[PDB]
Design a binder for this molecule. Sequence first.
Ligand code: HEM
Ligand code: HEM
Ligand SMILES: COCCN(C)c1cncc(CCc2cc(C)cc(N)n2)c1
Ligand SMILES: COCCN(C)c1cncc(CCc2cc(C)cc(N)n2)c1
Ligand SMILES: C[C@H](O)[C@H](O)[C@H]1CNc2nc(N)[nH]c(=O)c2N1
Ligand SMILES: C[C@H](O)[C@H](O)[C@H]1CNc2nc(N)[nH]c(=O)c2N1
Ligand SMILES: [Zn+2]
Lengths: 407, 411
Amino acid sequence: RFLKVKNWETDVVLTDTLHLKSTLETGCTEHICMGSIMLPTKDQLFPLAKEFLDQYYSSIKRFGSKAHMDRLEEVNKEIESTSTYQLKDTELIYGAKHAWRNASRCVGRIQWSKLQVFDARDCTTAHGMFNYICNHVKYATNKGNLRSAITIFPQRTDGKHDFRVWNSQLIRYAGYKQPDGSTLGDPANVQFTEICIQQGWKAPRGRFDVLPLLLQANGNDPELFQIPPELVLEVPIRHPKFDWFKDLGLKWYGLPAVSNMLLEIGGLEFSACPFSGWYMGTEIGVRDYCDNSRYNILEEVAKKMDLDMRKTSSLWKDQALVEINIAVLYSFQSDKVTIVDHHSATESFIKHMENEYRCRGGCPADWVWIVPPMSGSITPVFHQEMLNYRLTPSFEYQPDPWNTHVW
Amino acid sequence: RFLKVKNWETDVVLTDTLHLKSTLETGCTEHICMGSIMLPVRTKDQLFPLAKEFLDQYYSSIKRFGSKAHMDRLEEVNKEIESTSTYQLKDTELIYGAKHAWRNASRCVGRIQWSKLQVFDARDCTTAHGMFNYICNHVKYATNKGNLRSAITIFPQRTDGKHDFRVWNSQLIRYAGYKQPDGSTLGDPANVQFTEICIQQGWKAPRGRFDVLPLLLQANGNDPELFQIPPELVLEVPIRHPKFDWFKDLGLKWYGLPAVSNMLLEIGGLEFSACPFSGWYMGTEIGVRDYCDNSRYNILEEVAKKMDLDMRKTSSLWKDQALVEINIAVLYSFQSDKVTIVDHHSATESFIKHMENEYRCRGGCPADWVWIVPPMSGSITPVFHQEMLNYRLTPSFEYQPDPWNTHVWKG
Ligand code: HEM
Ligand code: HEM
Ligand SMILES: COCCN(C)c1cncc(CCc2cc(C)cc(N)n2)c1
Ligand SMILES: COCCN(C)c1cncc(CCc2cc(C)cc(N)n2)c1
Ligand SMILES: C[C@H](O)[C@H](O)[C@H]1CNc2nc(N)[nH]c(=O)c2N1
Ligand SMILES: C[C@H](O)[C@H](O)[C@H]1CNc2nc(N)[nH]c(=O)c2N1
Ligand SMILES: [Zn+2]
């Protein structure tokens, strides 16, 4: 019932007790592990609220206080009357920071307590959402000196008045299927792009077209907006030794900003809650650039390096991969945009994990997602046993809005 | 029940029904996943159902399920169990069992080869000397002058747990590790504890960086005995690099034959505590883990220096760069010496084809993503993008405690 995790490189053993408070389910059973699967009422609401306020009030050294009892009282009353309840600003900020703290797939959690929370619960229109998102983008970007931020739109009421950001990230590049059968731009975004077009976007059919925002307010029909180009900081990718690399015409955006997830706090559901930090290099250079179903540029780079691509055993793919990733880090650093390499980031996570075990009794972690997509075993996380479990507050996946939207 | 896995690179969806035959437990629950945890004397009572389940599998596989031969064999085993408290496998059942333990090994990326396994029956063995002879023969056969052949040698099964056969080596061939008084390590840091045992047992250590360890062999629960594998049977490969001429002067080599010797083979409820098995290497096993783990030979720094990479900041990716060149060298050296090896691209690609064939023909393929994905360049191999389902099937290979921790010393 008390669980040990071992680091096989250092022999350090930590004991996890935090998992005992987990409430949500993993998909795993006694007979089968689904660790590698990507996606595995008034009565309902009050224990959830209670669970949350209890941890909130415990966190501020005020457990079992009148103020605690008073709040529990008040929320209880409000749920009976209104069927829901409103979070105090303090609780909202706590909840959002803890949702990030609890994100078992996030390697960057050492930063969890330093999150700028933008309260957008007063928002009523897609123009309003556009304004809040531009402000988030400008704040987070901070001229290349990135700051973590989350903007929180109104909570779900009856699921009929959902606020949604239709984009999967605030900043992404469009993708277009050609007659040539090939794919222009980012293949991950073909379907969303067509939705934009079908809603009236005038695509400039390029290879790196910043997608417009498709914003849905109050369960209404989603509207289109273009982020001011001056607020979208982008980085041309060059290599510090290969002069030809710039000729590939590659660029990427500075701000990673997830916008399709759902924030759950004290049973309340925030379906529109865009959040952003800064990139780890491999996200762009390994996944975005080299994934076969993405920009998939390994072959071109390999050719320009004049590698023997006859046999897999020359490791030409691996060689190109390292260089591409060298160029990404080099390009961001050179333009003074915050980025972190996978060595630094995983090293930071090990120390965070130790802090969490030391000060919280554990740290939920998904090894499959925490270990970087290159050079896995030369990073300390590869050798670190991890326990994965779900705590709340949390960020959750939710269905793409277009499959669910009664137009 | 049906379970689907998706490949996020191809959108190929597979459906698993085999997991319904899973008997043993994972360590995971509805509330926690222990997928990254490395490690999470039977009564007649429990033994016959295990025998029966195994024999039903075996007879189905040969399309004789429910036959008189099937029925007679169940009867024969039942009687042998109730009179002798255990039973003996037929040679056919032993071979089937050992192949299926490999087929079922969810952490093994090389399973496309599972049906090609040479099984050496060493169940008539009685002494450590006899074990030494069997193991020498296995090494020679498996090595095959560099044209490696998979093999397994199976020693007598457990009886009362007081007469176990054990190979104390974790692998048949490994290099000594020596802890120095200054705290530095000579040789392979992984093998320091076992090296010290060997020394205590009377081994005269040459004390170099690549000393092949003696075999420490335990027959019938007796105290283990030391033997040196004849050097002529130990095939090694000097490591050099195709473009970098200074790489040879690093003084590296490795052995050709990976042969795991510390696991337990379970077949039909019977326990084979000594069952060394061998295949051939995937390059990263040596070039990534053996050479570049901080807790192993740990050569990234020296290599990176000699390449004159910028080592002042991790962001130069000097470690990643040196790591690739080392792995190129390992592959180059083995290929140049005509010793069987497979790169992580070939091996994972073959595994995906194997896995898909298994889903279609068997209803599933249990697989441990954490172990299947190679320790470098993960997402540029197809297994990274493949969802997998991990579950336990028997026959199986299991971990067992290290014998020095449990052995009752005779003296
Ligand atoms: C500040 C620097 C940050 C770094 C370096 C970082 C790093 C990462 C990385 C590498 C991933 C894996 C993503 C992928 O492979 O697709 C990830 C996932 C994730 N991050 Fe962080 N992150 C940061 C900030 C944040 C913040 C501020 C939040 C929330 C407030 C957050 C929440 C999450 C969540 C929920 C996931 C999982 C998404 C999913 O399940 O697909 N991260 N992070
Ligand atoms: C023929 C070529 C083979 C290749 C290329 C191969 C490859 C691998 C690799 C790379 C691993 C991961 C080991 C590690 O990272 O420490 C592994 C594990 C394993 N292999 Fe294979 N293998 C082969 C043959 C075999 C054979 C013949 C057997 C048994 C008859 C076998 C059974 C296993 C088992 C039980 C494990 C898990 C060991 C553990 O959990 O520590 N393999 N294999
Ligand atoms: C976009 O929502 C789904 C989450 N997934 C799968 C996803 C797909 N591509 C990129 C990201 C971005 C992950 C991410 C998020 C943040 C906040 C920082 C950072 N460095 N990285 C997430
Ligand atoms: C040695 O006991 C197993 C423990 N582990 C994880 C372990 C440690 N070092 C090397 C191996 C070798 C695994 C292995 C086995 C076989 C048969 C072929 C191959 N290519 N690789 C396994
Ligand atoms: C903690 C973690 O489970 C451990 O480091 C595992 C990870 N994956 C692995 N994968 C392989 N093939 N071999 C290993 O030794 C390990 N080690
Ligand atoms: C099938 C597998 O779960 C899938 O490829 C996962 C593996 N690990 C990952 N890890 C991260 N960080 N991001 C990902 O998108 C994935 N994809
Ligand atoms: Zn699991």
